[model samples]
Target: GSSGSSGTSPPTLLTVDSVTDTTVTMRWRPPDHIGAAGLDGYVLEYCFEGTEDWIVANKDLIDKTKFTITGLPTDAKIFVRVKAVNAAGASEPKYYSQPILVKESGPSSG
Candidate 1:
C-alpha cells in the first residue's frame, strides 16, 4: 500500500518497557508504510503533563526501535510520540494514548 505522500507513515504500536522517577524505557514497531525508499531512522519526542509543546527526546536519529530516556522529574506525568523518517521525509507522528507517570522506589538500606 502506498500513500500519496513520498515518505512512510508514522510509527505505531508504541510501548513502554519500564518507568522510574528519573528514567523511562520505551520501544516501538516500524511504521506501516515503509515507502519505496525504505526506512532511514526514527525521531522520538516527549513532553511533560499539562504541556502542549513536544521536545525532542533524542538529540540524534534513533536507528533502533528501542531506547531509554533518563533525567526526568519524580512523580511527574509524561507523554511520548514517534515519527518515521526516510530519504523522502518524515511521516506523521503517532502519540501515546495516555500519559505515563514516573514512580521510582528509593534506595534500600540494610
Candidate 2:
C-alpha cells in the first residue's frame, strides 16, 4: 500500500459549524490544490487530545464538504479532522483550532 501526502492538498477552513449532545456538525472548504487527477472526496474523523486515537465518523467517503458525526461517545484534546482523497492517495489531515467538549445537553442552543 502507498502512504504519502505528496501530490494532494489537505482541506482548508475546517471547523465545527455547530454541536449538540446528539451530534457534531462540521464544515470545511475543499482543498486549494486538488492536483491533476482531481479529488475523490474526503474522510471525516476525530482525534483525542493526548492518546491521539482517530475515530472515523463516516462509514463511507463523502463527496460533500459538510458532515455530522453522530452517536458520539463521552470523551480529548478533542479535535475534528478531514482528509482529502484523490487518485494519488489521501492528503494530509486538516484539523480544527479549538478543543470541543462532548457532553450531555444542559441549556442554551448548540
Candidate 3:
C-alpha cells in the first residue's frame, strides 16, 4: 500500500487441521506486510484455555507454513497464536476462532 515497509505483523490464519488427545496439527500464512525486515520466519505459541501464559511450541525458527504441536494437555482447552518474525521485531499475533478442546483419550490407551 505504500512505498515503505518496516513493520512486523501477525501471520494470516491459525488453522487447526487435525487434533488428538495430546497433539494438534495446524498451519498459517505469512503476514501481508513483509520485506525490509527480512521476514525471517514465523513463531507459534499456545496457552491453556486463555490463561495468557504463552508457551512456545517451536524449538527453532519456523520456516514452514505448518507445524504440529505435541505434549498438550488431555481433556483441557487451549488457545493458539502465531506471529511473523522479522528484523523489525516480533510482529502482531493472530489466533484461532475459538478454543480447542483436547480430548482425554489417545489412540493406543486403555
Q: State which candidate has the highest TM-score.
A: 1
**Number of the top-ranking candidate, with lDDT as the measure:** 1
lDDT of 2: 0.73
Q: What does candidate 2 score on TM?
A: 0.74
Q: Give lDDT for model 1.
A: 0.78
Per-residue lDDT of candidate 1, residues 1-110 (tens digit): 86556457787888887778788888998766578977877888888767778777887789889977778888888887787888777778777787777786556799
lDDT of 2 by residue, 8-93 (tens): 77888877677676676788887666678778878887775666478778887786789977776664226777778887777777
Per-model RMSD to reference: 4.9, 4.0, 5.6
Writing each residue's lDDT as its tens digit, candidate 3 over 31-101 gives: 77666647877788888765658888988788789887788777778787887777666666786788767
Q: Output the TM-score of candidate 1.
A: 0.79
Query: By lDDT, highest first, what's the ranking?
Result: 1, 3, 2
Instruction: Report, for every candidate in turn, its global Cα lDDT versus the true structure.
Output: 0.78, 0.73, 0.74
Using TM-score as the yardstick, the better of models 1 and 3 is 1
Runs in model 1 lying further than 4 Å from the true structure: 1-4, 105-110
Tell me model 3's lDDT, rounded to 2 decimals: 0.74
Poorly placed runs, candidate 3 (over 4 Å): 1-8, 50-52, 104-110
- Superposition error at 17 for model 2 (Å): 0.7
